[PDB]
Design a protein around this ligand. Structure first.
Ligand SMILES: CCCCCCCCCCCCCCCCCC(=O)OC[C@H](COP(=O)(O)OC[C@H](O)CO)OC(=O)CCCCCCCCCCCCCCC
Ligand SMILES: CCCCCCCCCCCCCCCCCC(=O)OC[C@H](COP(=O)(O)OC[C@H](O)CO)OC(=O)CCCCCCCCCCCCCCC
Ligand SMILES: CCCCCCCCCCCCCCCCCC(=O)OC[C@H](COP(=O)(O)OC[C@H](O)CO)OC(=O)CCCCCCCCCCCCCCC
Ligand SMILES: CCCCCCCCCCCCCCCCCC(=O)OC[C@H](COP(=O)(O)OC[C@H](O)CO)OC(=O)CCCCCCCCCCCCCCC
Ligand SMILES: CCCCCCCCCCCCCCCCCC(=O)OC[C@H](COP(=O)(O)OC[C@H](O)CO)OC(=O)CCCCCCCCCCCCCCC
Ligand SMILES: CCCCCCCCCCCCCCCCCC(=O)OC[C@H](COP(=O)(O)OC[C@H](O)CO)OC(=O)CCCCCCCCCCCCCCC
Ligand SMILES: CC(C)CCC[C@@H](C)[C@H]1CC[C@H]2[C@@H]3CC=C4C[C@@H](OC(=O)CCC(=O)O)CC[C@]4(C)[C@H]3CC[C@]12C
Ligand SMILES: CC(C)CCC[C@@H](C)[C@H]1CC[C@H]2[C@@H]3CC=C4C[C@@H](OC(=O)CCC(=O)O)CC[C@]4(C)[C@H]3CC[C@]12C
Lengths: 470, 470
């Protein structure tokens, strides 16, 4: 009961953060009809959460060293929970944007602390391997459950969708309070100048990329804000040389296999993210499943995901992370090839759509556990904070970049086969077929990106003694 | 009875040529101890067969049009059978070289004609699908049976190994005489200037490539002969513009998928050849099975490959050659990866060495049949000759090129890990472990080359209606 309560509590913010984003996307069309925030306001509710979430993420890495990881985890979750109630009673667009900003601040604090608590709470060995599986397990549970909740009670009101976080957030605070322990160690003074410039450098960049498409890539505020991001980054690196308790220990990233590992998670996160966004759109638009049915149809992915995670936790103590990552992805690679050839519109569910999802889930489950363990290997307690924060930022940063490339490819080929850009409800059924074939073509591009992750994963070179088996 | 006799006869030259090369390699050390031909003559017996086999191969493609494909097939096999007898009674090195030169001429005349007999003898449909499987099936039978025969009857005398072809060559000539019919079509005038220049260019290129390492890549005769190869190649292309019944119809290779299909077989042949050469050396050297035991241990490969060929012949009428080539090699890609991680010295036979061979054999069998049917698709009867000759030449040319790259990578990592260049019998057992891991490393490079074949195979685009299903 004690070990079970601890692993569930540590992975709580992965459940909440992934579930909230999926619900917010689902309920966007109605928030127009009620608030009338217009097409401009459509993207501010999304970008507001991402503006502070990425900006303050590297500040939240070092906030557990100077104050405490258990306190930091609880405070971040509590602020996230409170902000969800305020977002559910937003009067107009203005109230909603402040609400989404505060959720990003709370998530920026608790997300890095959750992955740091995995390394510092469970000693290397079977304990850390079981905890790693649960931490990655609940990220998929929240994603699928966000569809089901986002598709089930959407029909009544979008305000009840943001209140579902409140019961869940309260349970994670209670579990973390009575299951986690405060470490009795002296605090480290926070790096003021290093922490400030990192927030300014990151926040300005996120703002510039988000507003760029709205005003154009050469509007003047797009590259004008990029100038501030560049100037802040240059000043951050210079002061970082003579920094005490540094925010980003550049020296810890050398020519060894830490860069290879951290290069994989950035590009792997892009493949995982773009595969999730494209598949959801295809099932909703082409196959006409709807939000509720799509969420219930992805339940087998979670069960398949769990089987891969559970098997990998046992095998990680006998096989190096190199073979397990390759072995798991080989199953995933076959699943995407099958879908790229035999996934037209109107196919049945059980034979065609279930098996590739089940096979792909086991492959992903096998590869995530070795990669997470090697990302937190050979670090310690005085540098686990920033290293865990860097891991989550690269995973999230690689999402939008790879997906941006993929979506451009899908759009281009839809016009090539003969099609239109715009809402799917006004297509001629000859223009809908072109969109279908475009999505499967873009799945080959995702396969090419996955292959590059594999060759870069051949250079890891960690033994099962270092990542696990201690 | 008439059908089985016809398919066996057409593939007879594939069994003989593949069997002869394997037997010739096995018996080279003993030919040294008897004839005392020195190391220089050791390689001349091999190059003599290839010098005329590759030099005259393109000539034989158009020889069946002006003489007849049945008469051309009997003449080539007959000359091959006679020369094997002359090779078995060679008293000095001169007699052996002229004997090996004659065998290449016989193989050059019959090898292109055998593949052209597949397209002309059997109508497009299930009959041609079954004939193609048998044609590919007994190319593999000769290789494994060459090990068994060469490794068995070479503790008595190496001369007897060359007489084993005589019974087989006689049987194929009888079957071809009583099972094939001579087409009644008017003969075509041979392209005199085009044929002589094509022969001179191909022989000179082989000569310079073979003699280069002996005399050095800049000896004076190496690049001296390469000068003649370039001059003959240029003149061949110019005169082919105004050539009637061209030896190489360049216009038949446009931007369509004929180039993609013919580029796949070039590099696919290289992957197959280097995979066969390296696996044989590893089994004999690292594992120490010997030639006889190695041949008996590769019997499951032929059985496994027969299943792949038999299954693929049925499926080729419903699925395009694109998916079958990708589907078959996906099994082969996994087999190479498993052998690249769990294949050290001292492992048993049935658990570790049998299964990857069986899985790889089925994958190879699945992809061979679709590639062969698309290489002889949509040509006719007045150009099937030269097109079949080009298909075999690219397959044979790709072997040495890819294997040269692989063997260079093997040698470099042997020295890097700590190793010695020389015979394997003078090794320290610490120098022998380095050679073990060099071979396992090179298997990753063969898998990387296979991936390139796959992406290049995604551009084929043939439908099952064209290659088969008639
Ligand atoms: C090289 C420099 C590159 C820096 C660029 C950063 C741009 C931020 C991402 C783009 C903003 C808008 C889109 C978006 O982000 O959305 C995805 C997700 C929310 O999920 P969604 O709501 O989309 O739901 C899913 C739906 O189903 C599908 O539509 O947010 C994220 O995690 C984004 C990662 C950003 C956080 C970490 C890094 C930020 C700081 C940059 C450091 C370098 C600058 C330093 C100088
Ligand atoms: C990385 C290491 C970490 C180290 C660094 C430390 C970080 C630790 C974190 C670990 C957690 C990672 C994995 C978590 C998984 C999350 C994804 C998820 O659980 O979500 C499921 C998704 C639903 O997405 P949603 O719909 O909710 O959101 C989209 C909106 O709807 C649209 O805006 O779908 C799926 O089940 C994906 C199935 C993939 C299987 C293989 C593909 C087979 C091909 C079939 C043909 C398809 C047609 C072609 C189409 C092209
Ligand atoms: C000294 C000390 C080292 C010094 C530092 C080196 C750092 C690395 C740089 C090179 C990394 C690039 C890798 C190569 C690449 O860029 O290319 C991919 C590779 C090459 O071969 P290709 O076939 O691509 O060759 C065609 C050419 O690319 C065209 O020129 O591919 C492979 O062989 C990999 C086999 C495994 C793939 C199958 C399994 C999937 C992988 C797992 C995914 C898990 C997902 C995670 C789930 C979250
Ligand atoms: C410019 C250069 C021209 C092209 C080079 C061709 C390679 C020659 C063979 C080199 C000798 C060793 C390798 C070898 O020969 O092995 C393959 C096979 C017999 O196997 P082996 O009996 O050697 O045993 C195997 C051992 O285990 C491994 O060494 O021979 C062949 O088919 C080789 C190609 C000849 C057929 C057609 C292409 C030649 C004409 C080129 C035309 C373009 C020029 C234009 C101007
Ligand atoms: C292409 C389309 C055509 C269109 C154009 C028209 C042309 C039509 C032709 C069709 C015929 C093609 C295929 C025929 C197959 C021939 C090969 C064969 O039948 O021969 C078997 C070979 C024995 O070779 P030999 O010994 O005789 O000769 C070597 C000397 O001994 C050395 O000098 O072995 C094998 O069974 C290969 C097994 C591969 C399985 C996959 C790999 C698994 C990895 C396991 C770990 C291994 C250790 C690592 C090691 C690195
Ligand atoms: C108008 C006319 C049309 C235009 C003409 C185009 C011609 C072809 C050129 C491109 C072909 C090269 C392919 C690209 C490549 O080289 O790349 C492989 C590709 C991409 O991924 P990469 O990551 O490598 O891309 C590189 C990175 O960009 C480096 O930076 O991979 C795939 O998706 C392929 C999946 C299939 C492989 C698995 C199955 C095995 C294949 C069968 C072999 C059977 C053997 C036969 C036995 C006989
Ligand atoms: C459907 C028919 C016409 C088959 C033709 C397929 C080609 C049009 C596609 C198939 C796979 C594609 C490749 C798949 C993956 C990549 C990886 C891609 O690399 C990245 O994904 C980097 C993106 C990033 O890192 O941000 C560059 C293009 C390339 C080679 C693509 C080039 C074009 C290819 C060969
Ligand atoms: C202990 C460390 C050094 C091992 C890490 C593995 C890498 C050193 C190897 C693994 C496979 C290799 C790749 C395997 C295959 C190829 C194909 C090769 O493509 C070919 O053109 C070869 C075949 C041909 O010549 O036709 C180019 C290099 C590359 C990408 C190799 C580059 C180096 C890689 C990634």
């Amino acid at each position: 009961r004690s070990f079970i309560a601890a692993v569930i509590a540590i992975g709580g913010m992965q459940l909440l953060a992934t579930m909230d984003s999926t619900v917010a996307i689902v309920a966007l069309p109605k928030i127009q009809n009620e608030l009338s925030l217009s097409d401009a306001g459509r993207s501010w509710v999304i970008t507001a959460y991402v503006l502070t979430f990425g900006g303050l993420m590297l500040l939240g890495g070092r906030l557990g060293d100077t104050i405490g990881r258990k306190r930091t985890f609880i405070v971040g979750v509590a602020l996230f929970t409170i902000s969800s109630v305020l977002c559910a009673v937003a009067w107009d667009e203005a109230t909603l944007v402040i609400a989404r900003l505060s959720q990003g601040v709370g998530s920026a604090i608790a997300s890095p602390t959750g992955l740091a608590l995995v390394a510092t709470t469970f000693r290397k060995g079977p304990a850390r391997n079981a905890a790693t599986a649960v931490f990655a397990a609940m990220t998929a549970i929240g994603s699928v459950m966000g569809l089901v909740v986002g598709g089930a009670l959407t029909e009544v009101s979008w305000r009840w969708a943001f209140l579902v976080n409140v019961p869940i957030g309260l349970v994670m605070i209670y579990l973390a309070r009575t299951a986690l322990r405060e470490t009795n160690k002296e605090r480290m003074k926070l790096d003021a100048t290093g922490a400030i410039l990192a927030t300014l450098a990151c926040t300005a960049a996120v703002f510039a990329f988000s507003i760029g498409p709205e005003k154009g890539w050469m509007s003047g505020i797009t590259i004008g804000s990029g100038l501030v991001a560049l100037a802040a980054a240059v000043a951050f690196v210079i002061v970082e040389r003579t920094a005490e308790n540094p925010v980003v220990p550049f020296h810890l990233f050398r020519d060894r296999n830490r860069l290879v590992t951290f290069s994989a998670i950035l590009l792997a996160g892009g493949v995982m993210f773009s595969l999730t966004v494209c598949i959801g759109l295809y099932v909703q638009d082409i196959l006409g499943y709807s939000a509720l049915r799509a969420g219930v149809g992805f339940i087998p992915f979670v069960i398949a995901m769990g089987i891969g995670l559970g098997v990998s936790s046992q095998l990680v103590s006998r096989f190096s992370p190199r073979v397990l990552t390759i072995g798991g992805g080989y199953l995933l690679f076959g699943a995407m090839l099958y879908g790229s050839f035999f996934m037209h519109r109107g196919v049945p569910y059980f034979p065609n759509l279930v098996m590739p999802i089940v096979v792909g889930g086991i492959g992903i489950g096998m590869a995530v556990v070795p990669l997470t363990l090697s990302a937190i290997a050979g670090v310690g307690f005085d540098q686990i904070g920033p290293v865990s924060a860097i891991a989550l930022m690269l995973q999230s940063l690689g999402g939008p970049l790879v997906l941006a490339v993929i979506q451009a490819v899908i759009t281009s080929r839809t016009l090539y086969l003969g099609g239109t850009t715009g809402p799917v409800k006004f297509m001629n059924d000859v223009q809908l077929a072109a969109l279908d074939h475009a999505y499967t073509y873009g799945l080959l591009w995702v396969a090419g990106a996955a292959i590059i992750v594999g060759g870069m994963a051949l250079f890891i070179g960690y033994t099962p003694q270092q990542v696990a088996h201690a």
